Amino acid sequence: QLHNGLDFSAKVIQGSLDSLPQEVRKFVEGNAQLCQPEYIHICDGSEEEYGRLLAHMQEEGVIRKLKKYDNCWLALTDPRDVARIESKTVIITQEQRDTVPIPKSGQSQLGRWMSEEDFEKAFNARFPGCMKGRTMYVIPFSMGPLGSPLAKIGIELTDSPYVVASMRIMTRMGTSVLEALGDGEFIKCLHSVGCPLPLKKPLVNNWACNPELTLIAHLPDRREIISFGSGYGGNSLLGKKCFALRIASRLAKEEGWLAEHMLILGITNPEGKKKYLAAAFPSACGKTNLAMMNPTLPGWKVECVGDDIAWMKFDAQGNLRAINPENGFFGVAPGTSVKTNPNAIKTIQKNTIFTNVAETSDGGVYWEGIDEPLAPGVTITSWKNKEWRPQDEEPCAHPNSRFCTPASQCPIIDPAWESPEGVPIEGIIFGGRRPAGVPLVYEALSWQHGVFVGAAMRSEAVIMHDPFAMRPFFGYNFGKYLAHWLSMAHRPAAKLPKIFHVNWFRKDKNGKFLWPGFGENSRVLEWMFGRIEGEDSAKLTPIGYVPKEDALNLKGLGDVNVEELFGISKEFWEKEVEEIDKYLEDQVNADLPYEIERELRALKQRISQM
Ligand SMILES: O=C([O-])C(=O)[O-]
Ligand SMILES: [Mn+2]
Ligand SMILES: [Mn+2]
Ligand code: NA
């Protein structure tokens, strides 16, 4: 430099620009030049850093300590900033069609593209000087076990201490990640709450955000994630959805692997034989519930590898190896009870950050569906910081409120949850909320049919399409994604996992659920287990294999309505197939793999013959 305006060394309050890898320093310094932070804090990932940052946020009123628990915290946000906003979530590529198929109707439900040109304008409208008066935190994080050949590293720059704290839980972060990275490639993650000081607008609930300018951008060819205006969850914790789904799915396409919205669980039978299963459900269908299920069948054990995302790659032996890229659970809080999820309740008792849940007068947490009586006299403060009663119109916790907890604390965390080589997947489970027509469980007829079943997934929010549970998350053209899945069948040695589809939520003719669910879902898993083992416990139907008469263990369940629960009606499925046909033609069109259209034609024909 000729002057003093490019070297940010004097601004570093922890760490050293001289200690960073070359490309890390350039990423850090270049963005400091643009965003103009008062300070640069290079995170070390220490407990000391963590505790002090927590106490600082506490003193500022950004978070509250929950006194009932061990080292637990509560953040209440500005009500404008409570969730991911897909309309403000975009992927930038040279051509639109690389990001999304071109829909015949004109409006895509499979993603949202922005031109390079439009993003540049948006970027320039947002980031210059955006961190004035704030600390820029530098988060070196690994997605996956540090030593895993399947793990990927990112650097996230942020002006939110809430993000730092949450990222510590959700990823492996700190000095060891920088040491592991060296001069290797990393995903560039830039985040700002978009409120430079002095504040131009009112600070609501001590929660910095810029709703009008909120934009969550992905530049896969630049390996960059750029997010502005939201401090919340999947908008700000850049490793989770942005990196481990959107960027990663593109990388996976390029490199021969898969990045998927799937839980990973290990299940052991009463004979000591263990299998790993993956399952993709929409974000309201019992995913965390299944991942840390407490099975009701004697002698069965379920252990949790991950509850949200899976990175999967065939090894030289042909086994589909999976890792959980995350280091914690960012779970939806309402609906979590000792009934629905006893192991979740146990996990979140300590070292856990809660966001937008209710607080009890004795320093505890509360939300809809917690199904836990309070002592008389104990009162509730809602997520809106106001007195609340169980009979009031509005809920005490926001529907998208969250716990943010360490994975290592789950009482049934799998002993291989951090194994570098990953765990061998033997089955993949798709599923949704369908009150009618769709059986409790069926098995895909082939890999190609299995990919179709994934592609055809629909779930009651109105029943909407959500293929592979990836609708908000495709890093690239969904048709190409289908092609990618299909190509797995053409590599020699590959042991293709059996594919199943589940529906826990089928109802009778008056609104009553047909299946008790929760821990009883172990009875369905047992069937899958046996089918993987090659047992003839199946009956052929037009939609795939279903359990034979008496194949399902229904002991202790009373009078289960088997005929309704597993009923398949021509009328319903004629409608179903036409709807899938119209959806795929519109939304995928020219990019629809031949094999998928073939499976569609085949299903239609099987239905026509019943
Ligand atoms: O936060 C999540 O996990 C989601 O929205 O799928
Ligand atoms: Mn998810
Ligand atoms: Mn359930
Ligand atoms: Na707050």
**Closest ligand to Cα 285:** 3
**Probe target for ligand 1 pocket from 84, 326, 402, 405, with the most ligand atoms within 8 Å of CB:** 84
Mutate to test the pocket of ligand 1, among 236, 240, 241 (most ligand atoms within 8 A of CB): 241
DSSP letter, residue 72: E
The dihedral region occupied by 221, where left means phi > 0, alpha psi between -120 and 50, and beta the remainder, is: alpha
In a shared domain, residues 281 and 203: no
State the ligand closest to the CA atom of 58: 4
SS3 category, 193 = coil
Instruction: For ligand 1, say whether the CB of 400 is within 6 Å of any of its atoms.
Output: no
Instruction: Identify the nearest ligand to the CA of 77 by its number.
Output: 4
- From the CA of 287, how far away is ligand 3's center (Å)? 8
Regarding whether 462 and 429 lie in a shared domain, the answer is: yes
3-state SS, one letter per residue, for 467-496: HHHCCCCCCCCHHHHHHHHHHHHHCCCCCC
- The answer to the question of whether 284 is labelled as a binding residue is yes
PDB experimental method: X-ray
Q: Are residues 386 and 490 in the same domain?
A: no
Q: Report the nearest-CA residue for atom 2 of ligand 1.
A: 283
Alpha-carbon gap, residue 605 to 610, rounded angstroms: 9
Find the Cα–Cα–Cα–Cα dihedral 390, 395, 400, 403, rounded to 10°.
-30
- Where among 347, 376, 411 does a domain terminate? 411
Identity of residue 205: N
- Residue of minimum CA distance from atom 5 in ligand 1: 283
Rounded distance between C-alpha atoms, residue 599 and residue 603, angstroms: 6
With the most atoms of ligand 1 within 8 angstroms of its CB, the residue from 166, 246, 308, 459 to mutate is 308
Q: Is the peptide bond before 439 cis (omega within 30 degrees of 0)?
A: no
Which DSSP state fits 261?
Answer: S
Task: Please give the Cα distance from 429 to 450 (Å, whole number).
Answer: 10
Domain end call among 345, 380, 411: 411
Cα 353 to middle of ligand 3, angstroms: 25
510 is in an annotated binding site: no
- Centroid of ligand 2 to alpha carbon of 261 (angstroms): 6
Which residues are 156's β-sheet partners? 139, 189
How many helices and strands in the chain, by DSSP H and E?
16, 32
Annotated binding residue 137: no
Task: Choose one of 235, 236, 238, 283 to mutate for the ligand 1 pocket test, by most ligand atoms within 8 angstroms of C-beta.
Answer: 283
Return the structure tokens found at 107: 């409006």
Cα–Cα distance for residue pair 417/327, rounded to 1 Å: 10
**Residue 493 in domain:** yes
Report d(CA 111, CA 100) in Å as an integer: 6
Flag whether 107 is in a domain: yes
Note whether 572 and 428 are same-domain residues: yes
224 residue type, one letter: E
| In the block, residue with structure tokens 């908008």 | 235
**Position 2 in a domain:** no
Paired tokens of 54:
């927590």
State yes or no: 288 annotated in a binding site: yes
CA distance 560 to 475: 42
Q: Which CATH number goes with the domain that contains 342?
A: 2.170.8.10
117 and 149 together in one domain: yes
* 49 plus 74 within the same structural domain: no
Q: At 436, which CATH number?
A: 3.90.228.20
Which of 315, 220, 354 is CA-nearest to residue 364? 354
Whether 45 has a binding-site annotation, put simply, is no
Q: Are 172 and 141 in contact (CB under 8 A)?
A: yes
Q: Is the CB of 234 under 6 A from ligand 1?
A: yes
One domain, residues 404 and 518: no
Report the distance separating Cα 449 and Cα 383, nearest Å. 45
581 and 559 in a single domain? The answer is: yes
Any atom of ligand 1 within 6 Å of the Cβ of 308:
yes
Which residue has the least CA distance to atom 1 on ligand 1?
234
Residue 590 in domain: yes
Q: Give yes or no: residues 365 and 489 share one domain.
A: no
Provide the b/e sequence for 422-439 (b: ≥16 CB within 10 Å): bbbbbbbbbbbbbeebbb
**Domain-embedded: residue 419:** yes
Q: Which residue, among 139, 117, 133, has the nearest Cα to 194 in the 3D structure?
A: 133
Which residues are placed with Cβ below 5 angstroms of ligand 2, an ion? 308
Q: How far, CA to CA in Å, does 78 sit from each of 105, 232, 398, 405, 447?
A: 36, 10, 12, 22, 46
Domain annotation covers residue 3:
no
Residue nearest to atom 6 of ligand 1 (CA): 283
Q: What is the DSSP string of 412-435?
A: TB-TTTT-TT-EEEEEEEEE---S
**Domains contained in the chain, number:** 3
> Hey, is 504 helix, strand or coil?
coil
* Strand, helix or coil for residue 89: strand
**Active site amino acids:** 285
Ligand 2 centroid, distance to 140 Cα (angstroms): 23
1 found inside a domain: no
3-state helix, strand, coil in the chain (%, to 5): 30, 25, 45
Calculate ∠ Cα 120-122-125, nearest 5°: 110
CA 508 / ligand 3 centre spacing (Å): 17
Rounded CA-CA distance 289/307 in Å is: 9
Q: 363 with 385, same domain?
A: yes
The verdict on 251 and 111 lying in the same domain is yes
Where does a domain end: 197, 232, 256? 256
| CA of residue 288 to ligand 2 center, whole Å | 9
- In terms of residue numbers, what domain contains 513? 257-326+412-610
Distance in Å, CA 78 to ligand 4 centroid: 7
Among 177, 232, 241, which residue's Cα sits nearest to residue 205? Answer: 232
* Given resolution (angstroms): 1.9
Beta carbons of 322 and 276 less than 8 angstroms apart? yes
Which ligand is in closest contact with the Cα of 337? 3
Tell whether 132 and 194 lie within a shared domain: yes
Q: Which region, left, alpha or beta, applies to residue 131 given φ > 0 means left and ψ of -120 to 50 means alpha?
A: alpha
SS3 40: strand
CATH of the domain at 172: 3.40.449.10
